[PDB]
PDB file of C-alpha atoms in Angstrom:
ATOM      1  CA  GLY A   1     186.405 216.135  89.122  1.00  0.00           C
ATOM      2  CA  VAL A   2     184.016 217.983  87.130  1.00  0.00           C
ATOM      3  CA  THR A   3     183.646 221.718  87.650  1.00  0.00           C
ATOM      4  CA  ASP A   4     181.825 223.399  85.044  1.00  0.00           C
ATOM      5  CA  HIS A   5     178.155 223.250  85.748  1.00  0.00           C
ATOM      6  CA  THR A   6     176.891 222.598  81.951  1.00  0.00           C
ATOM      7  CA  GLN A   7     179.040 219.499  81.470  1.00  0.00           C
ATOM      8  CA  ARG A   8     177.676 218.371  84.912  1.00  0.00           C
ATOM      9  CA  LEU A   9     174.066 218.862  83.911  1.00  0.00           C
ATOM     10  CA  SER A  10     174.793 216.982  80.573  1.00  0.00           C
ATOM     11  CA  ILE A  11     176.365 214.060  82.473  1.00  0.00           C
ATOM     12  CA  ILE A  12     173.648 214.128  84.952  1.00  0.00           C
ATOM     13  CA  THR A  13     171.057 213.868  82.259  1.00  0.00           C
ATOM     14  CA  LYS A  14     172.675 211.000  80.362  1.00  0.00           C
ATOM     15  CA  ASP A  15     173.693 209.131  83.385  1.00  0.00           C
ATOM     16  CA  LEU A  16     169.958 209.586  84.613  1.00  0.00           C
ATOM     17  CA  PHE A  17     168.595 207.722  81.374  1.00  0.00           C
ATOM     18  CA  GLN A  18     171.218 205.044  81.662  1.00  0.00           C
ATOM     19  CA  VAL A  19     170.873 204.282  85.205  1.00  0.00           C
ATOM     20  CA  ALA A  20     167.048 204.474  85.214  1.00  0.00           C
ATOM     21  CA  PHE A  21     167.043 201.978  82.060  1.00  0.00           C
ATOM     22  CA  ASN A  22     169.361 199.704  83.613  1.00  0.00           C
ATOM     23  CA  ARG A  23     167.880 199.672  87.065  1.00  0.00           C
ATOM     24  CA  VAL A  24     164.178 199.052  85.289  1.00  0.00           C
ATOM     25  CA  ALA A  25     165.210 196.717  82.698  1.00  0.00           C
ATOM     26  CA  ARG A  26     167.331 194.351  84.989  1.00  0.00           C
ATOM     27  CA  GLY A  27     163.947 193.361  86.521  1.00  0.00           C
ATOM     28  CA  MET A  28     162.050 193.098  83.252  1.00  0.00           C
ATOM     29  CA  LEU A  29     161.485 190.409  80.371  1.00  0.00           C
ATOM     30  CA  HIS A  30     163.749 190.650  77.156  1.00  0.00           C
ATOM     31  CA  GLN A  31     160.766 191.283  74.726  1.00  0.00           C
ATOM     32  CA  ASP A  32     160.287 194.470  76.264  1.00  0.00           C
ATOM     33  CA  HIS A  33     163.614 196.087  76.754  1.00  0.00           C
ATOM     34  CA  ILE A  34     163.337 197.614  73.343  1.00  0.00           C
ATOM     35  CA  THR A  35     159.987 199.179  74.185  1.00  0.00           C
ATOM     36  CA  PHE A  36     161.166 200.772  77.264  1.00  0.00           C
ATOM     37  CA  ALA A  37     164.263 202.029  75.118  1.00  0.00           C
ATOM     38  CA  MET A  38     162.120 203.390  72.458  1.00  0.00           C
ATOM     39  CA  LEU A  39     160.127 205.074  75.262  1.00  0.00           C
ATOM     40  CA  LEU A  40     163.042 206.817  76.681  1.00  0.00           C
ATOM     41  CA  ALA A  41     164.325 207.490  73.203  1.00  0.00           C
ATOM     42  CA  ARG A  42     160.904 209.555  72.433  1.00  0.00           C
ATOM     43  CA  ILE A  43     161.264 211.220  75.915  1.00  0.00           C
ATOM     44  CA  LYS A  44     164.949 212.384  74.989  1.00  0.00           C
ATOM     45  CA  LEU A  45     163.600 213.453  71.537  1.00  0.00           C
ATOM     46  CA  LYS A  46     161.065 215.580  73.448  1.00  0.00           C
ATOM     47  CA  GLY A  47     163.619 216.870  75.844  1.00  0.00           C
ATOM     48  CA  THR A  48     166.260 218.233  73.279  1.00  0.00           C
ATOM     49  CA  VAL A  49     166.166 221.288  71.263  1.00  0.00           C
ATOM     50  CA  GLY A  50     166.491 222.219  67.705  1.00  0.00           C
ATOM     51  CA  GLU A  51     164.006 219.415  66.366  1.00  0.00           C
ATOM     52  CA  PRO A  52     160.707 219.143  65.243  1.00  0.00           C
ATOM     53  CA  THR A  53     158.119 217.561  67.304  1.00  0.00           C
ATOM     54  CA  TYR A  54     157.699 214.487  64.982  1.00  0.00           C
ATOM     55  CA  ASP A  55     154.134 214.036  65.937  1.00  0.00           C
ATOM     56  CA  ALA A  56     152.626 212.994  62.869  1.00  0.00           C
ATOM     57  CA  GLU A  57     155.499 210.693  61.922  1.00  0.00           C
ATOM     58  CA  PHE A  58     155.433 208.880  65.307  1.00  0.00           C
ATOM     59  CA  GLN A  59     151.457 208.818  64.891  1.00  0.00           C
ATOM     60  CA  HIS A  60     152.222 207.051  61.476  1.00  0.00           C
ATOM     61  CA  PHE A  61     154.666 204.636  62.976  1.00  0.00           C
ATOM     62  CA  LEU A  62     152.040 203.583  65.802  1.00  0.00           C
ATOM     63  CA  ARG A  63     148.581 203.991  64.521  1.00  0.00           C
ATOM     64  CA  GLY A  64     149.680 204.027  60.929  1.00  0.00           C
ATOM     65  CA  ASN A  65     147.304 200.916  60.377  1.00  0.00           C
ATOM     66  CA  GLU A  66     144.488 202.887  61.086  1.00  0.00           C
ATOM     67  CA  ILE A  67     144.620 204.412  57.685  1.00  0.00           C
ATOM     68  CA  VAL A  68     141.821 202.800  55.692  1.00  0.00           C
ATOM     69  CA  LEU A  69     142.640 201.717  52.289  1.00  0.00           C
ATOM     70  CA  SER A  70     139.635 202.169  49.552  1.00  0.00           C
ATOM     71  CA  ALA A  71     138.268 199.318  47.415  1.00  0.00           C
ATOM     72  CA  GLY A  72     140.744 198.705  44.884  1.00  0.00           C
ATOM     73  CA  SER A  73     142.755 201.938  45.710  1.00  0.00           C
ATOM     74  CA  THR A  74     146.012 200.117  45.333  1.00  0.00           C
ATOM     75  CA  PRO A  75     147.717 200.138  41.959  1.00  0.00           C
ATOM     76  CA  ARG A  76     149.980 197.264  40.681  1.00  0.00           C
ATOM     77  CA  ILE A  77     153.611 197.672  42.033  1.00  0.00           C
ATOM     78  CA  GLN A  78     156.303 195.156  40.691  1.00  0.00           C
ATOM     79  CA  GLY A  79     157.998 192.665  43.283  1.00  0.00           C
ATOM     80  CA  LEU A  80     155.824 193.879  46.241  1.00  0.00           C
ATOM     81  CA  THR A  81     153.159 191.324  47.635  1.00  0.00           C
ATOM     82  CA  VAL A  82     149.816 192.373  48.677  1.00  0.00           C
ATOM     83  CA  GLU A  83     150.424 193.442  52.370  1.00  0.00           C
ATOM     84  CA  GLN A  84     153.620 195.288  51.263  1.00  0.00           C
ATOM     85  CA  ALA A  85     151.411 197.038  48.535  1.00  0.00           C
ATOM     86  CA  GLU A  86     148.752 198.031  51.198  1.00  0.00           C
ATOM     87  CA  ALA A  87     151.790 199.218  53.401  1.00  0.00           C
ATOM     88  CA  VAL A  88     153.082 201.374  50.745  1.00  0.00           C
ATOM     89  CA  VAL A  89     149.942 202.707  49.932  1.00  0.00           C
ATOM     90  CA  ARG A  90     149.258 203.590  53.569  1.00  0.00           C
ATOM     91  CA  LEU A  91     152.870 205.314  53.873  1.00  0.00           C
ATOM     92  CA  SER A  92     152.106 207.180  50.680  1.00  0.00           C
ATOM     93  CA  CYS A  93     149.654 209.524  52.759  1.00  0.00           C
ATOM     94  CA  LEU A  94     152.509 211.009  54.602  1.00  0.00           C
ATOM     95  CA  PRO A  95     153.978 214.308  52.992  1.00  0.00           C
ATOM     96  CA  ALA A  96     157.524 212.844  53.261  1.00  0.00           C
ATOM     97  CA  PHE A  97     156.558 209.621  51.425  1.00  0.00           C
ATOM     98  CA  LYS A  98     154.361 211.022  48.710  1.00  0.00           C
ATOM     99  CA  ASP A  99     156.360 209.666  45.819  1.00  0.00           C
ATOM    100  CA  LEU A 100     157.045 206.377  47.329  1.00  0.00           C
TER     101      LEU A 100
END
């Protein structure tokens, strides 16, 4: 019942993502469903327009533990434990969270 081609294209793209996720994740363990959902989300983020590439932010999400903290570089922050302290001084390297 759909006649316009742009609406058909949008429906085809969304249904491609949905049917691919359904037919993959039915034969797949429940710990990894969110992983494939995240991969398809990043793929659709790449495909859409009007957005930045989010390369450095996803790099700090994936290999953000690769940031090396210096000896005694963490100051004292109230409430947070040592793991939260090293996490916030690792997040502070990003320009978006510079004043964290």
